[model samples]
Target: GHIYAVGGYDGHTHLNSVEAYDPETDEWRLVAPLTTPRSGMGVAVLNGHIYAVGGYDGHTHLNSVEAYDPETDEWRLVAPLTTPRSGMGVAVLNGHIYAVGGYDGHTHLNSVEAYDPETDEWRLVAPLTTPRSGMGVAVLNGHIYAVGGYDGHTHLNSVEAYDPETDEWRLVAPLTTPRSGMGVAVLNGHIYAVGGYDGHTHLNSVEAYDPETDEWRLVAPLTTPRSGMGVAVLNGHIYAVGGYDGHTHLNSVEAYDPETDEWRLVAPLTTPRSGMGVAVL
Candidate 1:
């Protein structure tokens, strides 16, 4: 039910391992390694396939995209991102993969681009209003939403929505806590922005955004304050995966129940890491 793949640890390390989780048994199994080790990238599941998008390769930024097949447990290279970047956000819309803002070599990039798997090509789309890296991307009601991230050295609270029909971006409700390296996902028509750093320290705050009212409300806080964690909504629960605190990198996994507004510890990740990515495959 959950395919949790994480790699790339900031500017110093790249992880090669992968893991898969089944909610029914609450067990995790190790999988094949990524063809290339990477972190600070974006991962998405669409059309029954998983794709890992742009991220840093230790020395320079990369535009490469790779696909994984759960049935075969194999990896294959796909089309590259238009803009080579790291810490970007990626989503699938209208049978295409849309990659949003990220950090290029020189600066944060606001450019938006889409990849067509059918043709194996990428096309430039409308740019984000604010350039940022480590933002979160999600699709709701046929639209793509990009949440909080850092612009240069400054953390941002801005939110932007992309209309696939028109290929344009419109500003939306901002996050209550401006942060970098947070996790964002939509469930039950509301957007949940999970734990990440707030410039000075890692935080446990979980905030919910209502598109209808254009307002953000606080939910429950994470038990562990961390940044660079991967979050996914699975089986009506929000799962926050491995990330780093100030002193230690984590292998712990926690589940959030919205109905009760509480967090309960699940099985920890097989390997401790942060700045990783996850998807339900």
Candidate 2:
């Protein structure tokens, strides 16, 4: 059985609700509601807890941070981010939560910050060399990789890695296609970036990155071309959740099995939303 949770929509528009899925029963059950509603945000799970990061509030960017615990079925507010942002990517490395590049209503940002739950404090970390928003964030091989995103003016193919021990960022090979709003995850040590927009059209193309050679190889394309979908790795497969198809929002959920190199449809979401975030616990 698998369980997941998502937060609000864009700033002014939001869903004050949360839901969890059980694969064994193929059913979704409503969970707890977040105190503050927002979307175009980032999520990271550390120590069996789900932490929701910066996002817009329909009127302005937010620095608020919150976390949910399934055991208690409650939501609690934590320290806010140093930089107010949305559309950024977040990941947990070595017990600290890292918030990456995003839009702040004024411009695209390359700033990165880390939050220590033990101290309830946030510190500025190495910034991404290239500023982008709506990108994917993944931690692999002890390094955090920031993948394809929009630079405000256009979608980007650039990739960069931040070494926690070195406290530095190094440029990695770029993506095969420039895109934004795609879903990315690590499976079997390789990073996979799924569907996103390529300036003019949405895409189904999937690609994998190999740290061994610092190169990326194209993988099987997605069955549906979409953007702003939730992507996560569980039980050795990648699950891409609901997103928009440019015309309308989608409720379809699909799973990709690397072993079979095939995709199988799963239970659809009750709500079809784009710009939503997802995390597995």
Candidate 3:
């Protein structure tokens, strides 16, 4: 599997740069830049290409969407979102892309939308129970899980799950700690939530949720506390990449082993950044 790091801010400027990591070689190489510079975008891979959804463009929230074709080394604009947003959670399930809660210029949003690549169209789905931004989302056991996020007022620990089959959302177990701008991944049938901001401070704490038990448990914490990080599962390891640690943008990367319950530092990114879109291909 390969990991793709997409558009984000580099502390001072919004960026369109993209990079691809080869786990086998432990190396990252530059790829085609995005058509638009953005941060806090959500990315999902489907049918062999990457989709980059709504995000901040330095000046304002954006509804624009773009698709990257690795075969052609090109990025092309696709259908835009129904509402402009940033810090949204995105996942692909059953061949459709679902964009969840995020911040529009006016408020935190709970609205959800789905995209059908075949039709090149987007339509509204059932809204989230809780309106929030910067949440982490993943599909596990045929359900889309949405975890901790900021609700404009406070960091939130609430967790919710959506079933497309039922067209309903239900509250599941919440995170052990309230957070936002974190990363979430499913490994070995469990959901792992990594570093994020806890309303007041950057956080290093990690937690895992077992859907069967409907509970959350503490897991190995990150070596470096961060927010707005990128995370993905590769070869059974959960890799946490660049993020903001309150004072500066971080390039440090680390990996977590569920078996050992330990975190080990990995090769750092060549460029430091935060709020980038990441996808495993």
Candidate 4:
């Protein structure tokens, strides 16, 4: 399996660069960079293509969206979001791309949008129950789960799930700890929330939520604490990419195995970064 790491800042400035990681060889290679430089964007894989959604571009919030075709090694612009936003929660479910809450520069957004690749259009969906930014989002069992994030004034532990069939959002179990900038991925039927900042400090803490039980439980923590990381699942293991440790940007990578409840270090990134988007293909 291959994991693609997409646009993010290099601590000093925003980047349009893209890279791919191969677990089979434990190596990474440069891919086509994004058409626009961005950080804190949402990326998801669907129909064998990687979609880069709205994020910050240093000067303004972005509504522009793009898709990367690995077969051709090219990036193409697509339908943009209705509102310009950054740090949004994004996920793919039932063949549509869902863009959840995000920061709009002036305020945290509660609005949500869904994109149809066939129609090349974006339509409003159910807004998040709580306005937030930088949350970890994932789709499991036909529902979109939005986890920890910032609600403008404070870090949030609130978790909510959306039902597209009804076009409504309902509160699920909240995170045990309030945080933002976390990386979330669904593995083995459970949604895992990895490292993130909790307003006061960068965290190494990890937690997993059981949708069947509607409860959150503590899991193995990351070896290196960080926030703004990118996470994806491959070979049934969760791989967490670069992020900001308390002091600096990191290039380190780590993998977690739920069966053993252990975290093992993996090959680090070529360039240290944070707030990148990751997808497995």
| C-alpha RMSD for every candidate | 1.5, 1.7, 0.9, 0.8
What is candidate 1's lDDT per residue for 181-209, written digit by digit as tens? 99887888888889888888898898998
In model 1, the Cα lDDT at residue 142 comes to 91
lDDT of 3: 0.91
Report clash pairs, candidate 3: none
Number of colliding residue pairs in each model: 3, 3, 0, 0
RMSD of 2: 1.7
TM-score (all chains, Cα) for each model:
0.96, 0.96, 0.98, 0.98
The alpha-carbon lDDT assigned to residue 55 of candidate 4 equals 94
State the displacement of the C-alpha of residue 187, model 4, in Å, after optimal TM-score superposition.
0.3
Residue 83, candidate 4: how far off, in angstroms? 0.9
lDDT of 3 at 73: 92
Model 2: how far residue 103 lies from native, Å: 1.3
lDDT of 2 by residue, 169-227 (tens): 98899999997999999998999999988888888888999999999999887888978
Q: After superposition, how far is residue 215 of candidate 3 from its true place, in Å?
A: 0.9
Task: List the lowest-lDDT window of 10 residues for candidate 1.
Answer: 3-12
257, model 2: CA deviation in Å?
A: 0.3
Which of the predicted structures, 2 or 4, would earn the higher lDDT when compared with the native? 4
